[PDB]
């Protein structure tokens, strides 16, 4: 099955360089164009450029906005795509996607990764502090405090709990983020059976479990 996975994104200092990776499988790689697109959080998609297929000589084109500063390459042995970025600015902070591409005629062959978050900032990386939020139905929560950069991911019971969950958009403040997640379950479930929020902050190699307990 067609796979694309972006990686190599995280925090980089302004003026820095950073190369993103995009591994692919499940289709004849060299037959497709490969494209890079970005999206500042809460903003709009911006096409960045592409590298063409084998028959087209693997040639490259770029958005005027990044011609001369970003470089696109592909390793046809690893079926890997790459985006080399230089002189990074706060404005370049975005989720970056790779997507399968081809001549305009075959638009329907588009297939995207889930992206990776690149935060350009001089702020220092900081792991999250996770606190439990105890009170017929009942609401529990988890406070995720004092971490940088985005992102963190919050699950309840490792993903078994998708219903009644409100994970809130992180918020910056003095170069530190703070987000929160509430889950609303029946009274017969908690505190009879455990409710545990699972917090992952990759950029600080952190994984924190937190059980919610009464009193």
């Amino acid at each position: 099955e067609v796979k694309l996975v972006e990686s190599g994104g995280g925090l980089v200092q302004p003026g820095g360089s950073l190369r993103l990776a995009c591994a692919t499988s499940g289709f004849t790689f060299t037959d497709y164009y490969m494209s890079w697109v970005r999206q500042p959080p809460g903003k709009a998609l911006e096409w960045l450029g592409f590298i063409r297929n084998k028959a087209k000589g693997y040639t490259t084109e770029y958005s005027a906005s990044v011609k001369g500063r970003f470089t696109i390459s592909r390793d046809n042995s690893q079926s890997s795509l790459y985006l080399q970025m230089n002189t990074l600015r706060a404005e370049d902070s975005a989720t970056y996607y790779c997507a399968r591409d081809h001549d305009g005629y075959y638009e329907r062959f588009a297939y995207w990764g889930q992206g990776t978050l690149v935060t350009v900032s001089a702020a220092a990386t900081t792991p999250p502090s996770v606190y439990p939020l105890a009170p017929s139905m009942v609401t529990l929560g988890c406070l995720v405090k004092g971490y940088f950069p985005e992102p963190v991911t919050v699950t309840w019971n490792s993903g078994s709990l998708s219903t009644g969950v409100h994970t809130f958009p992180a918020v910056l403040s003095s170069d530190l983020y703070t987000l929160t997640s509430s889950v609303t379950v029946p009274s017969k479930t908690w505190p009879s059976e455990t409710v545990t929020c699972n917090v992952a902050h990759p950029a600080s190699s952190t994984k924190v479990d937190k059980k919610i307990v009464p009193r």
């Binding site: 494209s35 406070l143 992180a170 929160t180």
Partner: protein, 215 residues
């Protein structure tokens, strides 16, 4: 340098209604050899990567409901949803692939719903947080409408972080969290802690509170 522009920037409509949205090209996207318009429409729901709906301006992609219709030729193009559904919440992007690639600024589609009331839960600082020098009280405003809402922090009769969830995908609702962040020692000094929730569903705030001395 093909430029794309979309209108309007935003759309709010109740379920069942019909909507259109437009996309203008700085030059013709019609290939005189395939006799096709290299203009595609993408839908991006919050938390997801863009997904294709229509290509060649007209032809729908597989699995895409027939309530979605793309049309136009040359430089002016439109997307029509015959009857909007709650799942249709998303930003809608047009994209030219005639020469390089370009996305318009998008069109955000919000949903109008039956004016609904919040659900308030109060949470005092966790043991773990107090033993860390700090202390935060959290308020969960769950599943209301519209977003017009404010929180008053009463202590015994600043340093606040708010965050609205994105509109739900079934109940078309909103949620919010006010995290009154505090120092342990000054949290230790007063008793009653309240979060008055001013909404346009009542001329009297929602009442959730606790006395620190009672914990």
């Amino acid at each position: 340098d093909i430029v794309m522009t979309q209108s309007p920037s935003s759309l709010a409509v109740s379920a069942g209604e019909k909507v259109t949205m437009n996309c203008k090209s700085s030059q013709s996207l019609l290939n005189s050899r395939t006799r096709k318009n290299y203009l595609a429409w993408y839908q991006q729901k919050p938390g997801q990567s863009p997904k294709l709906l229509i290509y060649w301006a007209s032809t729908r992609e597989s699995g895409v409901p027939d309530r979605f219709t793309g049309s136009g030729s040359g430089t002016d193009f439109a997307l029509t949803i015959s009857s909007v559904q709650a799942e249709d919440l998303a930003v809608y992007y047009c994209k030219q692939s005639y020469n390089l690639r370009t996305f318009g600024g998008g069109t955000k589609l919000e949903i109008k719903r039956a004016d609904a009331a919040p659900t308030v839960s109060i949470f005092p600082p966790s043991s773990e947080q107090l033993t860390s020098g700090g202390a935060s009280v959290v308020c969960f405003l769950n599943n209301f409408y519209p977003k017009d809402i404010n929180v008053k922090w009463k202590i015994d009769g600043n340093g606040v972080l708010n965050s609205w969830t994105d509109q739900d995908s079934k109940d078309s609702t909103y949620s919010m969290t006010s995290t009154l962040t505090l120092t342990k020692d000054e949290y230790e000094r007063h008793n009653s802690y309240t979060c008055e929730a001013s909404h346009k569903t009542s001329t009297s705030p929602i009442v959730k509170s606790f006395n620190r001395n009672e914990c």
